[PDB]
Design a protein around this ligand. Structure first.
Ligand SMILES: *[C@@H]1O[C@H](CO)[C@@H](O)[C@H](O)[C@H]1NC(C)=O
Ligand SMILES: *[C@@H]1O[C@H](CO)[C@@H](O)[C@H](O)[C@H]1NC(C)=O
Ligand SMILES: *[C@@H]1O[C@H](CO)[C@@H](O)[C@H](O)[C@H]1NC(C)=O
Ligand SMILES: *[C@@H]1O[C@H](CO)[C@@H](O)[C@H](O)[C@H]1NC(C)=O
Ligand SMILES: *[C@@H]1O[C@H](CO)[C@@H](O)[C@H](O)[C@H]1NC(C)=O
Lengths: 344, 337, 340, 341, 342
């Protein structure tokens, strides 16, 4: 009748229960239903391609050796220290650069045992999961980051993982991200990868993250538009102030190449070309083409006299063509990358 | 009999099994078949000259005292307790070129231990090693680094422990792509060293050599195009009307300064090495070309301060400079691939 | 009478006390009154949205199985090493990116047992808690970083957390922060969050923090004003030289953009528009308008009495721009200092 | 007679000595005399507002239960592995962001028992102690960083800490700091802080650190002096060479603003003004004054009508006032910050 | 004859051997002939005054109560996991900022026992040691970095360290350092430092390091020379186009001063002056003097035979600058390459 003696008879020294032999040995593979509660999310760094979570990973499984009938109460919230004395299913995340437990004033665990033998094991973890991240369109990209829960020491003939039927992944209220937002829908898939040593079980959950473009827009697109507008305004001046035209063109080129060089500092060195690269390169080429046209027209003016007219006509044609070409390129690029290529 | 009975019989503190004795003591050395599965590769850093790899190390050997008793039957392989994995004898193993490693233990220890009937025991564990590979940068933007793994036993002389690679597919990787590299799956050279330290016998060491080919797209779209555009801007300056100083001088000086700043920014990030590379050679050649444009303009101006002679020299230089730049580009690209 | 015998009879092997089961099992839920003493504070890095503290966390609870009467002394202090064989209530911080104990020459713990059975349990920890931050008005923001003490291994049917009656959290004398002021008033609330696994107790404390304006003001607010004053003085020129005037215009632009870029890069990402961004943008607009005035004066200088019109437009600009900046400055300061 | 027998009889299993019970239990408080030997000192980073130390902490106390008579020798070194089976006083540094032991090929701990009963216990540690800094005069400040030793689990009625009468804290010979100097004199005081749970003993040692200005002088003050001398030479040029003077003004302005950016980005964010900031702001103000005087001279020369004479006179007057003003500002700053502050 | 029984009788529970007492207690001090094999070497940065190594530290000592005669074999190799049952000498590095063992798939150590009682004990370490750096001539400095071995728990009366007679410190074949080159000769000394608690033994080995400057050449000296020569070319063109030349002067001065700022900020803080600082300061002075001379020419040119004087001074300085630059460069190079060191 003593609760300590009851615990000893259940899983203690006098119990005879062993924590090393899995339940239903030499029989059907024991199935484990797991669900994940997310407490934190963020620190998504593109340079190293990883993100940190803080999850309350829970596991459930049946065990006939842990069935009790002395206590009328169905659920026995036992001390977390017992978990070393009972069998625990191995479960490691396949893709994670580094994970660790949380131990403050105690180990963060709990033990709750039902009458029929069901066991609901939860734990607090901090995972630096790594998700591969494409940037075909860097500022307008929808990223899919994954978590792969799978067993290591047990073949699927012994251990089987499967998501909970209802509410598989829960998210704490008021969760926000510095630069992303978590969509409500989350995909659940069975990886069940094969190795040379057997057929290991695996469980995958997909996170769909869409990126808010406010900072990229405000800090990078507006300066480029202002720069090209200033280039047009500078070019509108006549040829009398030629040194001023050259100086303004040079400083436009300098500031824009500085912007382009500083654009790629915060992102991983990727072989492919992204949206920011295309935009910066095209607009810098626009400024360079304006400078080339100015030089050609100055060469025309370098020997009224059937040349000053020509030069003025070419300058007016350029003034009527460059803003229209820039606007048509801008609208084409924006619509293609908003609807035709990705997103929306 | 329960699984506990057979498990204790084959090994237990109570049974006559001593973990402190290698198999075949005072006899033939035990050979270990080593197999590596690469779960994740990448994060290769040039500044620190090391890379991180997540590898499922697998090793099996022969343990006569671990032979499965005849009572058990029906399974060719018997799984055992990863907790008891510490109880059995282990082949000591370590990585020679290892800055640090970090055992993975999430919700359980990450180790798998199969035991077969004949006595073979297969141990697979999850590792996260950070190997260092001294990489050459004589031709930096395009190069083939050879970063290597050196497995090696330490506590046992080669007369006691020996490492042999698996016969079929001893290294397996599942479609892993580095951010800037392209690992050749087929071209993975093998071989073993058996390094010998003075006064301590021979220690066996198997070895893996990876051939990493660096992708040049980022650097071609990063520096080469801006440098070409700067030299084209200098040529545009040449096409500008001569004997009109005000326009000419700022163009050349700004070209030179922009090129110098580009060289400094692109050389700051790379690791500091004694020998010269390709990127700085290209940058200094372009800087010297801009300098040549500036001194040519200075010569034109001093000749002006006869106009036909100055104009003739200016035209000759404006025709020659694209040609010599093209010749330099052709020879440089041909030499440096 | 021997202290070793007493220790063995109370927590020792012969005691029979099982530290593996909570007190009053199958009974009323034990209640814990916890108070936290703050020792060190600071390192509030806005880039990663977290701050670190050093707390002397203290807990109390009534354990009926630890009652003793042999020793006449009441507050019988005990060695910290005995804590491995005493029921320690579960407690973890809900919001913390990482926390660790402290060991130097020993484990920094304190245990104290009273006659009636109450137990005092103090422990020193270092926690890098995370508090989400709002930067709608960056330099003049009043922030509220949070700490949540809560249980993990016991339903509210077993363990209940609650603050102390008086002096719940006290800061050490002379506590200071690198760039913030920690005001005296602190708010205590019942957190008591819910999970699908049951009802879990949760205790919450809120710290009110405000950012000191001295550093940002002295660093950039004065220099931009002085640069604009220089531009105002430059509105009194009569177009002495064209390239020199162009360079004088560009220099102010360069100082302006360096300061603005530095201040914008000093901060993390927020989508909305902040105080310092508004100030820098308006400074950009005003210096750009100064450049446009230079261009307009250069244009109208060339060929009617256009000289008189040019002088009139120049004095109109010189009389308009200072007043425009004064009204913008007073408006922006008042809105983002009092009305927001 | 066997040494293992003696060790077991003294503090071993058969000894009966209980390490979980304070010596002189339920009586006078134990008396601990501690002295600390500093091995390494450096990594003083003001960005994180702390510094790293490496000390050989040594503690001595009295245990009446450890008196032995089998071995006539008094000074008896013992294996450090027995340090876990002997009472060890609690001692934690109050102000340290993070500290750790040192283990290499063994645990770095030394334990020694004398015949009477006195015990020595020396342990190696590395502490990242934090000391708040006052940067009112940053380039030439005097920093006092505090190391606080105090107990946690024992009230003043049980454990009492105190320094040693002779050589309380001893610095290793030849120790050098990258950017600081250590004064020989050190202050020792008792913090004896009071908490709400009781009175806990405390011990405080202060280091007087001063910063040498050599690097900061060379990096900041000399370039600004060269810039202002360049502005002086720019002033000496007559107004007819307007492009030269104006461009010299621009280079002064830009050099000064780059120096200001570097100085202000080299230090942690602090509300109050520091000496380097005031000095560099005054240098920027002088450069701005040179630009303003050049602009005024050019304006006067614009619209010969005996205006050239007055412009030359005012230019000479201002170019003779600039050296007096700069020299008086420099001497005033130097004397106040070197003697008065 | 049973290996388990032999191990038990040697140092196991039934052996009676005590690991808490040093060999030959109350007698002559036990001597340890330690030698160190270096495996890796690098990451030596002057910013925080440290460097890291990977050493195969091996120690040999006698132990009379551990010799055996049952097994005819002499060099009997035992497993690392048993090493906790045998006495080991206390040892630690004095100039150590932080170190850790290596635990990958096992514990990285090795123990061998000879018939006469000698014991070999090699345990892997990774030391982030620290040595003071002398940067009097930074780009072309020769630096001596030291590592120190000493015991803590025992006085000289109980434990005495010493090097090995032949090949005390070795280096793995083909070792390459990232920035320096390690001189083959290495010094060995006896620190034997004294504290107030006794006379602790100590052992020190000095590494002589020399820095290759070629990288510093390419990255720092060539750009400054190019910028200065650009200022020269700026001077070459006459004074007719005053605004262009003066603007080029401003921009070259700005870039040179930003180069100087970067050069001085790339390195930690030291009270004295270094060679790179002197070179950069002198070159900045040269460009400043060039700008000042151009300003003087403009002052003379602006209002007689004044243009002749301006041209004469221009030519005079155009001829004077090469001699000054060449003599300064050659003097600096010779002094800092031969006279200052070696
Ligand atoms: C668990 O689920 C598996 C897979 O559906 C099933 O075969 C098995 O019977 C279930 N129950 C147990 C106790 O293993
Ligand atoms: C390892 O190298 C040794 C050198 O003696 C050789 O005998 C052995 O065959 C090699 N092992 C393999 C698997 O090639
Ligand atoms: C503890 O506090 C709770 C909550 O007020 C109360 O219900 C309970 O009676 C208290 N005492 C005990 C001994 O549980
Ligand atoms: C230590 O200090 C206390 C308080 O002054 C004193 O009574 C005591 O005698 C001293 N020594 C010991 C061994 O307790
Ligand atoms: C160890 O070496 C020391 C130093 O040479 C010597 O005095 C001593 O006799 C040696 N052997 C022993 C067993 O102490």
């Amino acid at each position: 009748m003593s609760p300590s003696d009851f615990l000893d008879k259940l899983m203690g020294r006098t119990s005879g229960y062993d924590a090393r032999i899995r339940p239903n040995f030499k029989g059907p593979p024991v199935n484990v239903t797991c669900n994940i509660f997310i407490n934190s999310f963020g620190s998504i760094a593109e340079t190293t391609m990883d993100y940190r979570v803080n999850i309350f990973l829970r596991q459930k499984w049946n065990d006939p050796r842990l069935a009790y009938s002395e206590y009328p109460d169905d659920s026995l919230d036992l001390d977390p220290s017992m978990l070393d004395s009972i069998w625990k299913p191995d479960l490691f995340f396949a893709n994670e650069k580094g994970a660790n437990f949380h131990e403050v004033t105690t180990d963060n665990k709990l033990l709750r045992i039902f009458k029929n033998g069901n066991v609901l094991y939860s734990i607090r973890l901090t995972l630096t999961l790594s998700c591969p991240m494409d940037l075909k369109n860097f500022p307008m990209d929808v990223q899919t980051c994954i978590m792969q829960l799978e067993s290591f020491g047990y073949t699927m003939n012994d251990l089987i993982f499967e998501w909970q039927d209802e509410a598989p992944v829960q998210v704490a209220e008021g969760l926000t991200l510095p630069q992303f937002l978590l969509k409500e829908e989350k995909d659940l898939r069975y990886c069940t990868k094969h190795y040379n040593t057997g057929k290991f079980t695996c469980i995958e959950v997909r996170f769909h993250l869409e990126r808010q473009m406010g900072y990229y827009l405000i800090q990078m697109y507006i300066p480029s538009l202002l720069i090209v507008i200033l280039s047009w305004v500078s070019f509108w001046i006549n040829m009398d102030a030629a040194p001023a035209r050259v100086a303004l063109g040079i400083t436009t080129v300098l500031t824009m190449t500085t912007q382009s060089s500083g654009s790629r500092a915060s992102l991983p060195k990727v072989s492919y070309v992204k949206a920011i690269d295309i935009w910066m390169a095209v607009c810098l080429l626009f400024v360079f083409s304006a400078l080339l046209e100015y030089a050609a027209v100055n060469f025309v003016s370098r020997q009224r006299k059937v040349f000053i007219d020509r030069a003025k006509k070419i300058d007016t044609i350029s003034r009527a063509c460059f803003p229209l070409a820039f606007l048509i390129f801008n609208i084409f690029y924006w619509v293609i990358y908003k609807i035709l290529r990705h997103e929306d | 009999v329960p699984a506990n009975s057979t498990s204790n019989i084959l090994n237990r503190l109570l049974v006559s099994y001593d973990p402190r004795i290698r198999p075949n003591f005072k006899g033939i050395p035990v050979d270990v078949v080593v197999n590596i599965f690469i779960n994740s590769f990448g994060s290769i850093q040039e500044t620190t000259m090391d890379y991180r790899v997540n590898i499922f190390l697998r090793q099996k050997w022969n343990d006569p005292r671990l032979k499965l008793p005849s009572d058990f039957r029906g399974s060719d392989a018997l799984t055992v307790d990863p907790t008891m994995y510490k109880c059995l004898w282990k082949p000591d193993l370590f990585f020679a070129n290892e800055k640090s490693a970090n055992f993975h233990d999430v919700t359980q220890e990450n180790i798998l231990l199969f035991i077969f009937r004949d006595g073979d025991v297969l141990v697979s564990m999850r590792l996260s090693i950070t190997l260092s590979c001294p990489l050459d940068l004589t031709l930096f933007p395009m190069d083939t680094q050879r970063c290597k793994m050196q497995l090696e036993s330490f506590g046992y002389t080669t007369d006691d422990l020996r490492f042999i690679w698996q016969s079929g597919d001893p290294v397996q990787l599942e479609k892993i792509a580095l951010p800037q590299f392209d690992i050749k799956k087929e071209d993975i050279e093998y071989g073993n060293c058996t390094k010998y330290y003075k006064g301590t016998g021979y220690y066996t060491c198997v070895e893996v050599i990876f051939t990493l080919r660096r992708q040049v797209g980022f650097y071609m779209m990063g520096v080469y195009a801006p440098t070409l555009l700067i030299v084209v801007l200098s040529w545009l300056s040449f096409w500008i009307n001569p004997d009109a100083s005000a326009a000419r001088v700022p163009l050349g000086i700004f070209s030179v300064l922009s090129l110098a700043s580009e060289c400094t920014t692109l050389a700051a990030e790379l690791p500091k090495v004694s020998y010269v590379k390709a990127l700085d050679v290209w940058l200094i050649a372009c800087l010297l070309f801009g300098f040549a444009s500036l001194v040519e303009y200075a010569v034109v101006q001093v000749m002006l301060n006869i106009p036909t002679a100055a104009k003739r020299i200016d035209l000759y230089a404006r025709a020659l400079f694209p040609f010599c730049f093209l010749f330099f580009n052709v020879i440089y690209w041909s030499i440096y691939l």
